[PDB]
Design an enzyme around this catalytic site. Structure first.
Site, PDB file in Angstrom:
ATOM      1  N   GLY A 223       0.442   1.378  -9.495  1.00  6.84           N
ATOM      2  CA  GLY A 223       1.738   1.431  -8.866  1.00  6.84           C
ATOM      3  C   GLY A 223       1.976   2.800  -8.300  1.00  6.84           C
ATOM      4  CB  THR A 224       4.855   4.105  -6.239  1.00  7.24           C
ATOM      5  OG1 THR A 224       5.922   3.486  -6.957  1.00  7.24           O
ATOM      6  CG2 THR A 224       4.526   3.299  -4.968  1.00  7.24           C
ATOM      7  CB  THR A 225       3.470   9.022  -8.227  1.00  5.64           C
ATOM      8  OG1 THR A 225       2.080   8.923  -7.934  1.00  5.64           O
ATOM      9  CG2 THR A 225       3.699  10.111  -9.296  1.00  5.64           C
TER      10      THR A 225
ATOM     11  CB  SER B 283       5.578   2.153 -10.991  1.00  7.26           C
ATOM     12  OG  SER B 283       6.225   3.350 -10.584  1.00  7.26           O
TER      13      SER B 283
END
Ligand SMILES: Nc1ncnc2c1ncn2[C@@H]1O[C@H](COP(=O)(O)OP(=O)(O)OP(=O)(O)O)[C@@H](O)[C@H]1O
Ligand SMILES: Nc1ncnc2c1ncn2[C@@H]1O[C@H](COP(=O)(O)OP(=O)(O)O)[C@@H](O)[C@H]1O
Ligand SMILES: [Mg+2]
Ligand SMILES: [Mg+2]
Lengths: 242, 241, 211, 147, 244, 242, 98, 50, 249
Positions: free
Chosen positions: F28-30, F73
């Site tokens: 997932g995204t940071t 995320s």
């Protein structure tokens, strides 16, 4: 005590009028050196040695496995003092069948042929079996019985300062500048098998060799006992023993 | 087939699904030691936090299920919370319908019965936590009841839980062998904390800190926990013993 | 021996890390064996390579083997699974004896998912041909033949299936994942394929890599 | 043992009390108890090393008394009490004992000493497992000759 | 999830045949012999228990014979556990008929109702059917004495003499030779005992392993008296018919 | 087997399905969460996949109540379902006890919900981690909730691909300020460690989003960081990494 | 029958009196504690087969060499008894099958 | 074969008693021995069943 | 969703219901228990065991009271008895103490608990209780009775029976030791002596659990001045009392 002591001196065993002690079963984790020890005991005493893996004797030709251990046995009876190393007996292990196929019944025959040689009308003299098994739970009560087997040797993991004793054999071999981080190293490589301590030294020398020196600096080792310890426990056996 | 994948009986008559629950409570590597005083029950448990970026104060395993009854959890923290929530709900309910707060004995039995039901159902997974319930009841005195994931419980003179709990058993066994009674003859609850810490050091070989300990004490008619400042007073008091 | 001269790593595009790892594992011990010998440390018993097909692995061992001046052996485990116990056991034993003989040698074994998992020891578990061939692999990589000149490379699809006892240190040492190519890596692998044919300013490999 | 704080700090204190070594001596001549009280503090530390330095002081104090049969009981007793509790690790206090044990041998110049000394030595070593056990047997063995 | 552990238990085979019903008939062959014989003055139900022991109290047991209503009792051959549910359903149903029409339930109605439950379980729900076979002794005004067998599929068939459970074939063949329509309850008692001595489930037939019950119109004023004989009243009849 | 569902279990303590689900969150995204003195400052790396996209018009930051930021995320639909659920829980608390839900209380409820789906095979486990906190009456708090149903207090947390870079500098941020830091300064530090965690995503390009709930600035309301303040954070982070 | 009319089933359950007889035969070969009460061991053994008892004398006389004697005492016998009869752990499992 | 099994079984007991002639008592022991094999497998479906 | 309604207990092609056979194995792994019916009482007895020396066995009950005149004892799984004892008391009240105002007959109670067994082998999501129960009791219409509840969903009355791991041996003990006339006192002495051979540990009255459904105790009645009512016929024996009967062997 089981093996070596009645081979060199049967004189003490006859004098007392006790039966010679015979049979040992080795079991432990992977990596603990059952093979390393198999290789070692053979030297110490000097007795004739057949290293045979038990997955190695298996053939679709029925009674071929029974034939192989019977001849191995006849050879051992002649070549006294002799220890027969049956390694990884777990391959032809298990028990039952007769609703299985005739391959199993042969494995059961071989397992039984084992049984013939040891005790029956044949006996051991100054022949001697060591059986190694990697899982005791594949292994069968007919071979865990007293009869077969006087001392059932359970080999643990290397102890906390057992692991430190192994690092000494290995760090002896190497050329180094002087490493003083060995006490620290065994706290991080805790919960280790001896196979993986050997890996600890091979990795440290990688980093030494890559940097183009032949010396292992202590910094190369600190990093090294951490690099093996992360990946070891992630893909860990998680063996269960009796 | 499915005699190990759901909660149905095997030819062995032993439920493998249930066995697996006990093989997950010792993988969190938290030890507990619980002793009955002469007027109190003290439970100390590990609280190993190896991170700078976890707040250690919020890392806990002692949950107050009643104002008088503490509960210390050995095993995974999702299942801990669910078992805590359910236990709190029942304890409140008991006050509501019977006019007095739920006993330690019966609260243990109630979670025990729910655990059996969770292993009766083949789509419901049991909560894989060993729950120790400490109290001082007025009809049972200082008490420990320890329930387990299967749905079995019994009372205890003292008990321990965790992977290294056999070592703890050795200390406790000697203590109650010599005294010849089922509790510690110590009339100050603070000194039962001091004793408990001593046997934890003896058993595990580990030197403790205030941030590796978490202490719950049930005295008569109240349950409190020590803060790390108060636990430090006890650790200094070991040096004064 | 089915050695073809070096494929060359320039021509196996993308996946810089995989290329970096093989050099470190193989060539560095083979060339710099003298330093490993003086020190008395062991040269890698194996390197496990795992990850999805077509990640280049074959190309790479075949390049490496010519450079390092070891022979290329072709061994594929799905073949060795048979109905006959005797016949199936025989070629494992033949391949081990022949490797040591033709040593130094890079044995390249494909698709070791046919050695399977053993995690159980019940009545049926494979009838003792599936369990049995796992244990025959463990004697390959046991130090009853010197595996400091032999270097065992193997490819497998997943290790999660396979029992983790076989996977430990000295079985296999380095445990090296081969991921898919990324966006930029795709473009490198496309270009070399295209390099073979007529190459023109119309084509942009990056463009094709992003789609 | 643990952390990096005990190695330095504890050592630092033992230096400071080793500069205050003449102070302990002067008080010991006036009354035993005054200087004894100082040894108690010293042998409660957490680094193993700082107790090596300090276990010289435990041996020296009773030497300055010269030596007293009544006082002898307590010194060997205090050690036994410190061993069960911690000793800064149970391995640590065994090397302390080993230092004080040479003094017992060479103190010997009476029957009187010999008798009291065997009673302290037999007890110490029942929970130990090193070279202490050889030495116990040996001093016991002086009373054997007499027997 | 839920569909993972289901194997589609109740379905047809390529022959058309319901797996669980085929299996069910095997488990009723495990259970003891039960024979019913319809006389022209009653119905004799005689069953040999599938359990006997010297520590087993069999002198208060009525594990095969159960009264559903005052004129209808059953003998059981199959799983006792499974049968218990149908037995209390039958009691409820017979009482329900009595409540609503103030008339005793005919034997046909009661048997049909139980049969519908057994069919229903293989039809829907994935439920196992009841693996039992009952022989119903019943009196009604309209058809007189009626004898019925029910099978675990959920179908009922009339008879004059019939056997279910263990040794169905052996019992049936003896009945074919001996049965007559001029038989009375007296004659039927003797026939039942003789048939059970030749279809015995061990090497002995005894009073204490015999459950025995009749329904006789020999009670005064044309009334029907259900009598379940105690094992010592069975013993009296055991010496009468010369089994002992 | 023991990996078909989530109420299969193994002697290894593993539950498989749940562990598998964390891999979605790890790709997932940071996203980060900084525990500050006055509040919390969330920041999330928002990937720019194309030039066709509308910048700062797609959010992964949804407010719960008026004072709880929540940023997640993993699988966006699944996380939007978890946040949708927790907007109801906040409303329920507000209905019954007439107060905006406390941050420790909010964590308890969510943990129960996520627990339920790992106890039944007829519903699928969640595979998202949410980072949520805010300012309530017991002070500022910060929680990260694992898809397992585990949460803790955090002085810093991170999730996504670039969690390695973020966490390493969050250690240094707590070593810069062991007595804690202002929410206002933490804007510029949140920017800095998203920029350093974009070196794990340097085949890609990004938009910096920052959101806060702090007593000092936003008065215990969760708001977005925008305009000149946002641009200052960008300029700060730019010079540091240069 | 007719293949095999004689069929001998061998127990391991035994009798107290049966265990005394195995000991004697052994004792002829190598006397086990001939200055101490043998009869305690007999009481204590309660599942043991003839085999375990043969393993006992032989393992005791292993311990004889260590202790540096040519005689086997009752102390040797008691440790021979202690082990070789405590295999498995099922203690924990049976807590929840009680 | 089972019938035949009685004859042989009967002569074990007569032999021991040191009486040649077979008797009712020699018979009662002999039928009990042959029936033992069968009673034991018949008590497990005669008792402890459903 | 849920779709568990397919019975877990089903016929096998060789007959028998497979799931309950499996469950019966668990009864013969459990503790040993026995019950002898005398002509002047009933005795039921079982062995207490512990997995820790720090466990208390005075907080552990394996003989429980269902009604004042009917007690129960199990062999099998601990958890499964724990839930089922509560349900036994509950159905005894709903089906005869709110309808007929009194405690149920021993025959009646046994039948009802066999239905609870039966419906835990019917429909999905429920596997049987892996216990067998001896339910000894007294009713005023058939005197003393001793029953054995099967995990099948059936029961059997007995004159004396045993259940558990050592059942087979124990019932052969009771076969010579049972007679047409027996005393409750001698019944106890048989029961302890038999359970001596089924206990591998301690044999004290603290570790041997004994309970009688003997005759009424008007000190357990809880009230006086009603002569019509009779006190609890059941009476669990305290450890000291059991030690006296051990000396009476
Ligand atoms: N005692 C030791 N001292 C030195 N090195 C050791 C020792 N024990 C093991 N090792 C190292 O670990 C390696 C692994 O041991 P080994 O090959 O004997 O395993 P094993 O326990 O037989 O496993 P398997 O179950 O695969 O048969 C050795 O080759 C050696 O390098
Ligand atoms: N990185 C690469 N660059 C160029 N082509 C490649 C690359 N990797 C794989 N290929 C192509 O895909 C084929 C299959 O890969 P191969 O090396 O045989 O793999 P594996 O052992 O992973 O199954 C090659 O023969 C080649 O045509
Ligand atoms: Mg090996
Ligand atoms: Mg390929």
């Amino acid at each position: 005590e089981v093996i070596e002591l009645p081979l060199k001196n049967p004189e003490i065993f006859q004098r007392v009028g006790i039966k010679p002690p015979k049979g040992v079963l080795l079991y432990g984790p992977p990596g603990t050196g059952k093979t390393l020890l198999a290789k070692a005991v053979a030297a110490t005493i000097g007795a004739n040695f057949i290293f045979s893996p038990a997955s190695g004797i298996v053939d679709k030709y029925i009674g071929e496995s029974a034939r192989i251990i019977r001849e191995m046995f006849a050879y051992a009876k002649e070549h006294e003092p002799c220890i027969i190393f049956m390694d990884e007996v777990d391959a032809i292990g298990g028990r039952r069948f007769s609703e299985g196929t005739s391959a199993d019944r042969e494995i059961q025959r071989t397992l039984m042929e084992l049984l013939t040689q040891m005790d029956g009308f044949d006996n051991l003299g100054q022949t001697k079996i060591i059986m190694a098994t990697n899982r005791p739970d594949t292994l069968d009560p007919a071979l865990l019985r007293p009869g077969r087997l006087d001392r059932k040797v359970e080999i643990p993991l290397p102890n906390e300062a057992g692991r430190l004793e192994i690092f000494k054999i290995h760090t002896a071999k190497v050329k180094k500048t002087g490493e003083f981080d060995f006490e620290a190293a065994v706290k991080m490589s805790d919960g280790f098998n001896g196979a993986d301590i050997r890996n600890c030294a091979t990795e440290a020398g990688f980093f030494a060799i890559r940097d183009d020196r032949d010396h292992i600096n202590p910094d190369d080792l600190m990093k090294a006992v951490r690099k093996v310890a992360e990946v070891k426990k992630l893909e860990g056996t998680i063996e269960y023993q009796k | 087939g499915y005699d190990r994948h759901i909660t149905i009986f095997s030819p062995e008559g032993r439920l493998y699904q249930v066995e697996y629950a006990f093989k997950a409570t010792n993988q969190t590597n938290i030890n507990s030691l619980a002793v009955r005083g002469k007027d109190c029950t003290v439970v100390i448990s590990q609280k190993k936090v190896p991170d700078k970026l976890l707040d250690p104060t919020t890392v806990s395993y002692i949950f107050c299920i009643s104002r008088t009854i503490g509960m210390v959890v050995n095993g995974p923290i999702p299942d801990a919370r669910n078992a805590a929530l359910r236990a709190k709900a029942e304890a409140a309910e008991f006050r509501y319908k019977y006019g007095y707060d739920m006993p330690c004995d019966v609260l243990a039995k109630r979670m025990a019965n729910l655990s059996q039901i969770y292993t009766q159902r083949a789509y419901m997974r049991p909560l894989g936590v060993i729950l120790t319930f400490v109290s001082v009841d007025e009809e049972l005195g200082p008490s420990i009841y320890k329930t387990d994931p299967a749905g079995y419980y019994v009372g205890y003179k003292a008990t321990a839980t965790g992977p290294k709990q056999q070592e703890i058993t050795t200390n406790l066994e000697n203590h109650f062998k010599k005294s010849k009674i089922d509790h510690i003859n110590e009339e100050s609850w603070e000194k039962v904390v001091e004793f408990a810490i001593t046997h934890m050091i003896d058993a595990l070989g580990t030197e403790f800190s205030k941030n590796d300990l978490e202490v719950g004490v049930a005295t008569k008619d109240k349950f409190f926990t020590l803060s790390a400042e108060n636990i430090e007073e006890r650790l200094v008091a070991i040096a004064e013993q | 021996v089915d050695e073809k001269p070096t494929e060359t790593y320039s021509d196996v595009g993308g996946l810089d890390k995989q290329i970096e790892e093989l050099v470190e594992a193989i060539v560095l011990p083979m060339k710099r064996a003298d330093k490993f010998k003086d020190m008395g440390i062991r040269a890698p018993k194996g390197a496990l390579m795992y990850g999805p097909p077509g990640t280049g692995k074959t190309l790479l061992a075949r390049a490496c083997a010519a450079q390092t001046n070891a022979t290329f052996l072709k061994l594929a485990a799905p073949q060795l699974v048979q109905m006959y116990i005797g016949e199936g056991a025989k070629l494992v034993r033949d391949a081990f004896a022949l490797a040591k003989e033709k040593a130094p040698t890079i044995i390249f074994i494909d698709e070791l998912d046919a050695i399977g998992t053993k995690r159980f020891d019940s009545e049926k578990s494979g009838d003792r041909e599936v369990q049995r061939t796992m244990l025959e692999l463990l004697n390959q990589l046991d130090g009853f033949s010197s595996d400091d000149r032999v270097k065992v490379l193997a490819a497998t699809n997943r290790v999660d299936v396979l029992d983790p006892a076989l996977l430990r240190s000295g079985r296999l040492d380095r445990k090296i994942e081969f991921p898919l190519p990324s966006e930029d890596s795709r473009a490198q692998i496309l270009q070399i394929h295209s390099r073979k044919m007529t190459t023109d300013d119309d084509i942009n490999w990056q463009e094709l890599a992003r789609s | 043992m643990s952390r990096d704080a005990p190695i330095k700090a504890d050592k630092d204190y033992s230096q400071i009390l080793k500069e205050e070594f003449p102070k302990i001596d002067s008080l010991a001549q006036n009354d035993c108890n005054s200087a004894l009280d100082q040894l108690l503090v010293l042998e409660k530390k957490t680094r193993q090393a700082s107790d090596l330095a300090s276990s010289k002081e435990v041996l020296a104090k009773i030497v300055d008394l010269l030596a007293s049969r009544n006082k002898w009981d307590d010194l060997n007793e205090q050690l036994t009490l410190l061993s069960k509790k911690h000793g800064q690790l149970k391995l640590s206090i065994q090397y302390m004992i080993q230092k004080v044990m040479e003094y017992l041998k060479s103190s010997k110049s009476l029957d009187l000493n010999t008798r009291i000394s065997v009673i302290e030595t037999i007890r110490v070593v029942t929970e130990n497992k090193i070279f202490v056990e050889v030495e116990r047997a040996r001093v016991t063995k002086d009373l054997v000759e007499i027997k | 999830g839920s569909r993972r552990y289901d194997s589609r238990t109740t379905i047809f085979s390529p022959e058309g045949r319901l797996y669980q019903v085929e299996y069910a008939l095997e488990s009723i062959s495990h259970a003891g012999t039960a024979i019913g014989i319809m006389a022209s003055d009653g119905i004799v139900l005689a069953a040999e228990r599938k359990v006997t022991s010297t520590l087993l109290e069999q002198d208060t047991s009525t594990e095969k014979l159960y009264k559903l209503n005052d004129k209808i009792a059953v003998a059981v051959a199959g799983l006792t556990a499974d049968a218990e549910i149908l037995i209390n359903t039958a009691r409820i149903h017979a009482q329900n008929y009595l409540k609503t029409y103030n008339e005793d339930i005919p034997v046909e109605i009661l048997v049909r109702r139980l049969s519908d439950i057994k069919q229903g379980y293989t039809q829907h729900g994935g439920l196992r059917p009841f693996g039992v076979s009952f022989i119903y002794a019943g009196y009604d005004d309209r058809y007189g004495y009626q004898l019925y067998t029910s099978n675990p599929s959920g179908n009922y068939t009339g008879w004059k003499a019939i056997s279910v459970g263990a040794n169905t074939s052996a019992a049936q063949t003896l009945l074919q030779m001996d049965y007559k329509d001029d038989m009375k309850v007296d004659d039927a008692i003797e026939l039942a005992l003789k048939t059970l001595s030749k279809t015995t489930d061990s090497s002995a037939l005894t009073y204490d392993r015999l459950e025995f019950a009749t329904i006789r119109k020999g009670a005064n004023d044309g009334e029907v008296y259900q009598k379940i004989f105690k094992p010592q009243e069975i013993k009296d009849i055991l010496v009468k018919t010369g089994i002992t | 087997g023991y990996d078909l569902s989530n109420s299969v279990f193994s002697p290894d303590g593993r539950n498989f399905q749940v562990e598998y689900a964390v891999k979605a969150v790890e790709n997932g995204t940071t996203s980060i969460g900084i525990k500050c003195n006055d509040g919390v400052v969330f920041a999330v790396e928002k990937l720019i996949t194309s030039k066709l996209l509308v910048p700062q018009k797609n959010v992964k930051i949804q407010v719960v109540d008026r004072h709880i930021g929540c940023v997640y995320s993993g699988l966006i639909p699944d996380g939007r379902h978890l946040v949708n659920r927790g907007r109801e829980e906040a409303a329920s608390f507000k209905k019954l006890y007439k107060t905006p839900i406390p941050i420790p209380a909010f964590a308890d409820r969510l943990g129960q919900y996520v627990q339920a789906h790992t106890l039944y095979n007829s519903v699928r486990p969640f595979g998202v981690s949410t980072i949520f906190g805010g300012v309530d009456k017991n002070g500022a708090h910060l929680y990260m909730l694992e898809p397992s149903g585990s949460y803790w207090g955090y002085k810093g947390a991170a999730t996504g691909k670039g969690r390695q870079s973020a966490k390493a500098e969050l250690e240094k941020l707590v070593d810069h300020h062991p007595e804690g830091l202002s929410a206002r300064e933490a804007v510029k530090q949140a920017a800095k460690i998203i920029y350093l965690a974009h070196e794990d995503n340097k085949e890609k390009d990004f938009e910096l989003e920052i959101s806060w709930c702090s007593l000092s600035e936003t008065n215990g309301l969760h708001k977005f960081v925008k305009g000149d303040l946002l641009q200052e954070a960008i300029d700060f982070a730019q010079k540091e990494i240069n | 029958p007719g293949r095999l009319d004689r069929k001998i089933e061998f127990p391991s359950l035994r009798d107290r009196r049966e265990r005394r007889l195995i000991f004697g035969t052994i004792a002829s070969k190598m006397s086990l504690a001939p200055e101490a009460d043998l009869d305690s061991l007999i009481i204590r053994n309660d599942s043991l087969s003839g085999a375990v008892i043969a393993a006992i004398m032989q393992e005791a006389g292993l311990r004889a060499v260590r202790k540096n004697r040519y005689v086997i005492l009752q102390s040797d016998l008691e440790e021979a008894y202690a082990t070789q009869v405590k295999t498995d752990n099922t203690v924990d499992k049976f807590d929840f099958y009680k | 074969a089972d019938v035949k099994g009685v004859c042989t079984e009967a002569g074990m007991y007569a032999l021991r008693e040191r009486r040649i002639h077979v008797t009712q008592e020699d018979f009662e022991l002999a039928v009990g021995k042959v029936m033992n094999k069968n009673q034991e497998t018949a008590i497990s479906v005669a008792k402890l069943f459903k | 969703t849920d779709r568990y309604s397919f019975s877990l207990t089903t016929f096998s092609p060789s007959g028998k219901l497979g799931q309950i056979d499996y469950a019966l194995t668990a009864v013969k792994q459990g503790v040993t228990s026995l019950g002898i019916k005398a002509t002047n009482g009933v005795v039921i007895a079982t062995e207490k065991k512990s997995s820790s020396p720090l466990a208390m066995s005075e907080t552990l009950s394996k003989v429980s009271l269902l009604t004042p005149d009917i007690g129960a004892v199990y062999s099998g799984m601990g958890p499964d008895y724990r839930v089922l004892v509560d349900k036994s008391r509950k159905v005894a009240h709903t089906s005869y103490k709110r309808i007929y105002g009194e405690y149920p007959p021993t025959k009646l109670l046994v039948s009802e608990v066999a239905k609870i067994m039966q419906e835990a082998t019917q429909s999905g999501g429920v596997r049987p209780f892996g216990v067998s129960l001896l339910i000894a009791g007294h009713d005023e219409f058939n005197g003393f009775s001793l029953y054995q509840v099967d995990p099948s969903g059936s029961y059997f009355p007995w004159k004396a029976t045993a259940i558990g791991k050592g059942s087979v041996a124990a019932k052969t003990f009771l076969e010579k030791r049972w007679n047409d006339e027996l005393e409750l006192e001698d019944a106890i002495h048989i029961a302890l002596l038999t359970l001596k051979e089924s206990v591998e540990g301690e044999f004290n009255g603290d570790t041997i659990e004994l309970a009688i459904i003997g005759d009424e105790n008007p000190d357990l009645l809880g009230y006086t001045g009603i002569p019509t009512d009779k006190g609890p016929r059941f009476r669990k024996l305290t450890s000291q009392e059991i030690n006296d009967r051990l000396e009476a062997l």
